[PDB]
């Protein structure tokens, strides 16, 4: 099993500084 | 089993500094 | 089993500093 | 079983500093 | 006639296990 | 006639286990 | 005639186990 | 007649296990 | 007649295990 | 008649295991 | 098993500095 | 098993400095 | 001048038969 | 002048038969 | 002048029979 | 002048029979 | 002048029978 | 002048029978 | 520090004339 | 620091004349 | 630092005359 | 630093006259 | 530094007269 | 540094008169 969601989204006129995304372990 | 939600969303005219997202363990 | 919600949302003209999101354990 | 809600919401013209969200254990 | 709505929606950071959708009869 | 609504909605950081939706008869 | 509403809504950080929705008859 | 809606939607960072969708009968 | 909708959507950073879609009967 | 929709969509950074799609009957 | 979502999204008029994405472990 | 999503997306009029993407381990 | 509001709202699981809306004169 | 609102809204699982909307005069 | 709104909205799992929309005069 | 809005929207799992849209006069 | 909007939208799993759209006059 | 919008959109898993679109007059 | 909210909102069938928004100083 | 929100929102069937938005200083 | 949001949004059936957006200083 | 959002959005059936967008200074 | 967003978007059935976009200074 | 977004987008059934885009200074 283990159906695992990740990151989904919309950035519209937005700002994001130094994101750290780890998909695992 | 283990159906696990992640991160879904909309950023509209928004600011997010140094997010840390870990999807696992 | 274990159907587990994550983080879903809308950021509209908003600010979020250094969020830490862990989806697991 | 264990149907577990997470975090859902709307941030409109809002500010949130250093949130810590843990979805697990 | 018979204008019949179905299923429309948004899943944001969410989990749904074994859904059964029947559009008919 | 028979204008019939279905299911419309938003799931934000939510969990739903084994839903059964029948649109008909 | 027969204008019939269905199910519309928002689930925010919520949990719903084994819902049964029948739109018909 | 019989204008019949199906399934339309957005899955953003989400998980769905073993869905069963039947469009007919 | 019988104008029948199918399945339309967006999967963004999402996971779906063993879906079964039948368009007919 | 019988104008019948199929499956249209976008998979972005997503995972789908063993889908079964039947367009007919 | 282990159907695991990654990162899917739209950047529209947006800025992202030094992102670190690890898909594994 | 292990169906694992990667990174899919659209950059429209956007800027991204020094991204680091590792698909493995 | 003449800043004039129109009709804004949410219909959730609701039914409305033969509405007549005129925005003008 | 004459800033005039129109019709904005959400229909979720709802039914509306034969609406007549005139934006003008 | 005359900045005039039209019709904007979301139909989620909804049904609408024979709408008549006139944007003008 | 005369900046005039039209029709913008989302149909998700919805049904609409014989719409008549006139953008003009 | 006369900046005039038309019809823009998304049909996701939806059905529309015999639409009549006139952009002019 | 007369900047006039037409029809732009996405049909995803959708059905549309006998549409009539006239861009002119 | 200084996590500062901006302007987030929904305008549904509404009218707003000559707004002046300054996000800064 | 200085995580600063901007302007995020939805305009549905709405009218806005001569807005002035300055994001800076 | 200085993570600064811009303008993100949806215009659905809406009208906006002579907007002035300055992203800077 | 200075991660700065711009303008991201969707115009659906909408009208915008003489916009002035400056991304700089 | 200075990661700066530009203009990203979708125009669907929309009209825009004499836009002036300057990306610089 | 200075990673600077430009203009990216989709025009679907849309009209744009005399746009002026300057990418520089």
What secondary structure does DSSP assign to Q1-25, as a single string? --EE--EEEEEES-EEES-EEEE--
Interface of V with U (CB under 8 A): 1-25
Contact partners for chain W, using 3 or more CB pairs closer than 8 A, are A, K, L, P, Q, R, U, V, X
Q: For G24, name the nearest residue in chain E, comparing CA atoms only.
A: E25
Lookup result for tokens 């987008």: X9
Contact partners for chain O, using 3 or more CB pairs closer than 8 A, are E, F, G, H, M, N, P, Q, S, T, U, V
Q: Which of O4, O14, O19 sits opposite N23 (nearest CB)?
A: O4
Entry resolution in angstroms?
A: 2.2
What whole-number distance in Å separates Cα of residue O12 and Cα of residue W14? 23
**Residue F11 structure tokens:** 């799931």
Interface of U with P (CB under 8 A): 11-17
Q: Beta strand pairing status for E20-23 and F20-23?
A: parallel
- Residue T13, CA distances (Å) to B8, F8, O5, U16, V15 in order: 26, 20, 5, 11, 11
Q: For H12, name the nearest residue in chain K, comparing CA atoms only.
A: K8
Residues in S touching U5 (Cβ below 8 Å) = 6, 23
Residues in T touching B11 (Cβ below 8 Å) = 8
Instruction: Count CB-CB contacts under 10 A for residue R18.
Output: 12
Lookup result for tokens 């809606």: H5
**Chain H interface disruption, residue of P10, P15, P19, most H CBs within 10 A:** P15
Instruction: Count CB-CB contacts under 10 A for residue W25.
Output: 12
Experimental technique used to determine this entry: cryo-EM
CB-count burial class (<10 Å; 0-12, 13-18, 19+) for Q16: buried
CA U14 to chain centre: 15
Contact (CB<8Å) E14/B7:
no
Residue K8 bridge partners (DSSP): A8, L8
Which has the closest alpha carbon to I6: I23, P9, I18, I20?
I23
- Residue S9, CA distances (Å) to D11, D13, K19, M3, S12 in order: 9, 7, 29, 19, 10
Q: Do chains U and B touch (3 or more CB pairs under 8 A)?
A: yes
Contact (CB<8Å) U16/P3:
yes
**Residue B7 structure tokens:** 């991160």
Q: For A11, name the nearest residue in chain K, comparing CA atoms only.
A: K11
Q: Which of I11, I12, I16 sits opposite A9 (nearest CB)?
A: I12
SS3 string, B1-25, reads CCEECCEEEEEECCEEECCEEEECC
What whole-number distance in Å separates Cα of residue V9 and Cα of residue R10? 16
**Residue O19 structure tokens:** 């709408």
Residues in W touching R3 (Cβ below 8 Å) = 15-17
**D13 and B12 in contact (C-beta within 8 Å)?**
no
**Residue C20 structure tokens:** 């830490």
What whole-number distance in Å separates Cα of residue S2 and Cα of residue U2? 10
Residues in N touching G9 (Cβ below 8 Å) = 12-13
């Amino acid at each position: 099993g283990a159906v695992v969601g990740g990151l989904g989204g919309y950035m519209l006129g937005s700002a994001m500084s130094r994101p750290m995304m780890h998909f695992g372990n």
